[PDB]
Amino acid sequence: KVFGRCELAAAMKRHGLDNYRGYSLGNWVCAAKFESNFNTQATNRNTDGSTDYGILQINSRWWCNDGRTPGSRNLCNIPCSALLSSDITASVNCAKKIVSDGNGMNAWVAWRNRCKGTDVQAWIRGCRL
Ligand SMILES: [Cl-]
């Protein structure tokens, strides 16, 4: 599924992301925009043997199991295919675990490079929330 911005914001709010660990909703929408362009089926296959999966481009070395990645930790305790669904619940649950395991949002390279220090409220402006 390719989400709209406001539709994704509403889904993320229903799943508890607004102000999760001090990160406002616009941060999460901005991260999804620049990681995947709002596409739930996005995959990026890296040269190190790992793959980034889904709307938040979660990596297979530490977070999910794809059976093909060296050094796998599977800290979200899920198959990586669960991150390619049209429903965002598995991606949101794993994103919460990434911040709970002592990372901030710096774990997402696109957040650090394209969202940090910007007006992230722009990403939710005008939406029905
Ligand atoms: Cl907000």
Q: Cα–Cα distances in Å, from 6 out to 17, 59, 69, 81, 110? A: 14, 26, 35, 25, 20
Q: Report the chain's C-alpha Rg in angstroms.
A: 14
Is residue 18 part of the annotated active site? The answer reads no
Quickly count: other Cβ atoms within 10 Å of residue 104's Cβ.
14
CA distance 40 to 91: 9
Catalytic residue among 18, 52, 66, 119: 52
Q: Counting beta carbons within 10 angstroms of the beta carbon of residue 108, is it exposed (0 to 12), middle (13 to 18) or buried (19 or more)?
A: buried
**Share in percent of the chain as helix, strand, coil (round to 5):** 40, 10, 50
Q: Does residue 127 contact residue 13 with C-beta atoms inside 8 Å?
A: no
Q: What is the DSSP letter of 73?
A: -
Task: Give residues with Cβ within 8 angstroms of 3, minimum separation 6.
Answer: 11, 32, 38, 40, 55
Binding residues for substrate, by number, are: 101
Catalytic residue among 7, 35, 66, 87: 35
Structure tokens given for 75? 């800290």
Domains in the chain: ranges and CATH: 1-129 (1.10.530.10)
* Beta sheet of 58-59, edge-to-edge order: 43-45, 51-53, 58-59
Pairing of strands 58-59, 43-45: unpaired
Using alpha carbons, select from 125, 104, 115, 129 the residue that is nearest to residue 20.
Answer: 104
Annotated catalytic residue 48: no
**Ligand 1 mean position, distance from CA 28 (Å):** 10
CB neighbours (10 Å) of residue 114?
A: 15
Cα 19 to averaged position of ligand 1 atoms, centre (Å): 7
